């Protein structure tokens, strides 16, 4: 299980670190424009590896990825818009560089407008999965202060944050659940508090880069083990003409299928008020 | 983090194995009036630690559990087997309680629902818990989440009541993705419909892997004060016996006790299966 | 990472559940002649799997070890028990090199050194390793790991030769902390007799052992991991398969390192390659 | 198992993500003067939890270290020592028992002066353990194994002034010298002298080094670790292998050195005492 990322900022580093620790992979290729960030990373990182299962490490150039499963693309450089083609301009460098290399890999931007530039990376790309990590990280925050909340671990809270990566994201309020049950009538049952306050709090909680760090490693050991995990993660969403976070079942070949959430007419409406911002901009 | 287990049958020392192999605790001590399997499972098990994680294990007497977090007692006509069951108990669970006191009681050997019973009395001012139906529940989910196309932990579901052939799955809250499992079923196009069920409900009623594994979560849940919700057998004075229903666990054992809203069907059967154990009882 | 266990008696089984819970593998087959076993075992280590790091776990024939990297070997029933597992073998390693040509072929059936020279026999083009003393030189280790008090990774030692009574300890090398373990114990102060190195040899000399034993070497293949494991390999030398330090990987034994014994440890060696010799 | 870190800078954050990592504790508390910053890691933290294992992660403040095991402080000298003097009497306050597991530089006096301010409490410094594990990590690479077959001390001062114990470096149980030849490997001062430049140079092996001193505390592991902690036969603070468990450190191993290794040791131990 081989994984390579592009761009050793704080995000593919910490991302790196993350599938080290856990053993995620057994070989880890760091590629960046500034080889030396790339030589210190990936010795730094190297006298890391958990004994029960070690991971070489190494900095290379792109012709490393060869073989990659999975290639984390974290390359990226005032407006949000020429953040937006800045990286456009670096994208359209790197994506045909990694296809080179790793035409069979799933490709995973996290580089940011995530959105966006999934539906770049998906051009540049069209023969390869192309997946943006758009709101799984939001989507754990989501279910990790419900779950606080409920007083119960967070595996027996399930919710979703869909749409756009950013303030114009939506929680599926609607679909919030703990241990089986809507999480209103879970807090009823168990006496706790539950209201707009509540939520409104919540609210501004689930919107350092250890968060994104691991969350691309949860990402990338979906593929690898191909484990058909149910992630919103972002991709070209025909529906909406934009690449959007939607839960998806996620494994080896990617995105195996896409289950839309039924959404109140209010939340239904900021996805797509959320759809429409992308559109410009695209 | 100390674990002790009392009885190092299969099950106990496939337990033990688990926890090892997993790094769930730091000391683990087998304890057997087999003083001689007890020393040899040690020795053996002693030897399959994880390095990114060492477990310091050996064999002793009920002394040495001092101190433990967690002891799971697995020493071990369905009439015959209980009252037979019973009487080591009685030897048994002072022994533990004398060694350690505050320590929570996880109790597996058959009848596990009566001897929990049992357990509890012979061992009061102590959190006592029975593994129960965990190992039903999960198989349940499992199965769901395969026949689903997804990973399991998007899967949930409750295996109810009695740990045996009286128990209750809870189709009528099983749920994968967020969703009533047909509802998904409906939403992937997948095939849904009596039979399916019929040989889910087969597979989850079915070598003691999959019981050493589970014995180690519920273990993780309390030693690491975890809150997780676990279909484990106790008291429930709503029923006047011991039996399983979904139960928030930590450090301190159970927590709270979530009843479950069942189908008139299924309630029905859940009382039949009280009523059962009752009788025993 | 793929891994199919052949023979689910309670050494491949207890193995299978050692890789499982470790998240040794992503993907693992049970094969056995007795197809009722395989589908209960398969379906109760399902049950038994880390959610991190998830196994899809099942039964099936030998067809099903396709893209097997590695298969654990461990079908088994002395002159007699080598002749009645040799014939086994002889009728399920062309099954595996069948549907895995590929795979690191993993032998633990006894007697190991010689089966395994007989599977290298029957799969030649393929690695194939027996688990020989890898589980000796851990005891070995850890034993005397727990006699000086510190962590078994400071301890080293190899268990040599036969696995067995003939299997030889290699004290002339075991070392503590970097030194020689009689220097070890004398700086700490602690006893060190021919007392108390005959009752280490003596634990040296269930299954979770042996099964945890050959999840490390299945890692360190599936991994790649350039272990240094005590397998059992043909030893040219020698004229037979033994167990030696070696250096294994995904392709199996990449190296051989001979260790320096003292003359009476290579006569305990050689003798005890005379008897495999035999068989 | 509890585990505080006080002071959330770097190497205080990095340390934190890999125990939360590996699941090496269940309760972790930051303690941080700069108490916005101590919130949001540990709400960021709070995350790369693996579900089985899995840790409470929060912020707050000394009184939250009680009951800790461990306690790492990551909180130039003149100015530092004014902060452990502040500090560590806090920490001593609130969690007595934890082991104190100092890591700021310079290291091994500020381990010699939380020693002082700490008595009747173990205190032990990061020292060289991540270094001696470089020195190793980089004979297995040149070996051609795993590197838990290599073994080799960095020993004395953490920086320029430590000394590699070239003398009983091994891989295999052999001198690596001779394992080299028998591998046919290439082994000549050239070779040794790039080891050494990369053995004695980004917090990610320092943080997975804090973590692995944590877990040998927090598991009773009796590993060997070149910690640093007062060395009376030196008369300061100095790393050595010592034997490490959950009552800090058990034993010291003086290693046996050539007249020249023992050299530079004892020339580093007066470079201390000021």
């Given at each position: ?134 709101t799984?990280?939001?989507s ?18 399930h919710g979703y944050?869909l ?9 599926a309020?609607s679909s919030?659940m ?50 058909r995990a149910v992630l919103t993660v972002?991709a070209?969403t025909?529906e909406?003409?934009?690449?959007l976070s939607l839960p998806r079942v996620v494994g080896?070949?990617?995105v195996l299928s896409t289950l839309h959430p039924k959404l ?7 996805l ?11």
């Amino acid at each position: 299980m081989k994984v390579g990322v592009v761009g050793t900022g704080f995000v593919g580093s910490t991302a790196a670190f993350a599938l080290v620790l856990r053993g995620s992979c057994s070989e880890l290729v760091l590629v960046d424009r500034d080889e030396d960030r790339a030589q210190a990373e990936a010795e730094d990182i190297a006298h890391a590896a958990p004994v029960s299962h070690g991971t070489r490490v190494w900095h290379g150039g792109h012709s490393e990825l060869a073989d990659a499963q999975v290639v984390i693309l974290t390359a990226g450089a005032e407006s949000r818009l020429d953040l937006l083609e800045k990286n456009a301009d670096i994208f359209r460098e790197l994506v045909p560089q990694i296809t080179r290399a790793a035409p069979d890999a799933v490709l995973l931007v996290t580089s940011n407008p995530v959105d966006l530039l999934t539906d770049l990376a998906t051009q540049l790309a069209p023969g390869q999965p192309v997946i943006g990590s758009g709101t799984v990280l939001d989507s754990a925050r989501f279910r990790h202060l419900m779950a606080q909340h409920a007083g119960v671990d967070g595996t027996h809270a399930h919710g979703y944050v869909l749409g756009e990566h950013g303030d114009s994201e939506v929680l599926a309020w609607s679909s919030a659940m703990v241990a089986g049950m809507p999480v209103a009538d879970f807090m009823q049952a168990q006496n706790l508090p539950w209201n707009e306050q509540v939520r409104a709090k919540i609210d501004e909680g689930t919107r350092t880069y250890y968060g994104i760090g691991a969350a691309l490693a949860r990402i990338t050991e979906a593929v690898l083990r191909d484990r058909r995990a149910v992630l919103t993660v972002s991709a070209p969403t025909p529906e909406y003409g934009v690449s959007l976070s939607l839960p998806r079942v996620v494994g080896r070949q990617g995105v195996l299928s896409t289950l839309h959430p039924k959404l109140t007419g209010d939340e239904q409406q900021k996805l797509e008020q959320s759809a429409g911002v992308l559109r410009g901009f695209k």
